[PDB]
């Protein structure tokens, strides 16, 4: 029985290696990675890979791995797929831990924009969880943490992490991680998957996919939103993506809204993640 080596970048930046049978469905590899991680609340997570166009794709656990990675390497990342709107309702601390690791990368990468003060507050909770109570011995007036807190580090940000870290004495790791999440979940881009697009008139927009629906970003004026329950049908055709909206009260007709994506793969990718969000957050 012929086996393919899989490599998975974990959220702590370490590499997990295993073998699966070459005709294996994605779920096989996902189950091995979650067992490695001691993760039971698996439904929020997934594996990604980079395609022949170097775009992020979710590995579909119900499809053969070989039919998704096709010509590319069997190289994956373990990621949060569905960001819970209320992480306090997760059953296990370890789930919250992995969600914090993902959010730390969302912040350092700049996918999750964050004010100076919230960068410092999130950093302070991470330091409190992982090192415990503040110790002056380790940190002089010139201390720079090894922890990555932001897309751009400043001395002033390091100073503020330390000042807030002092205020968390006695706080235990699950408690600090819960505080991390109670702050992070409020950020306007929390759990938003962003896709470049153009409207039916050719204006550059961004489409954001998240728990609360499909968001349309044009600039800093007029953020439109379609809550998932209003969305009856999502579809794609060539480079175009369409949403069918329920008729409003007393309206005779449904309305279809059309967008232009970079190419056909990008339209299919956006369709798939919208359908998955719609189903997941209908049920959650
Ligand atoms: C630098 C990595 O730790 C080792 N390289 C394997 C690899 C690559 Cl190149 C890309 C995405 C996932 C994986 Cl697993
Ligand atoms: C290349 C850089 O990311 C600039 N952005 C281009 C862009 C954006 Cl932000 C949104 C929609 C369409 C397009 Cl083309």
From Swiss-Prot:
The annotated subunit structure for this chain is: Interacts (via FERM domain) with CADM1. Interacts (via FERM domain) with PRMT3; the interaction is direct and inhibits the protein-arginine N-methyltransferase activity of PRMT3. Interacts with PRMT5. Interacts with PRMT6.
Give disulfide pairs as residue numbers: none
Function comment: Tumor suppressor that inhibits cell proliferation and promotes apoptosis. Modulates the activity of protein arginine N-methyltransferases, including PRMT3 and PRMT5.
Q: Which residues form the FERM domain?
A: 4-284
Tissues with expression = Expressed at high levels in brain, with lower levels in kidney, intestine, and testis. Detected in lung.
The name on file for this protein is Band 4.1-like protein 3
What is its subcellular localisation? Cytoplasm, Cytoskeleton; Cell junction; Cell membrane; Cytoplasm
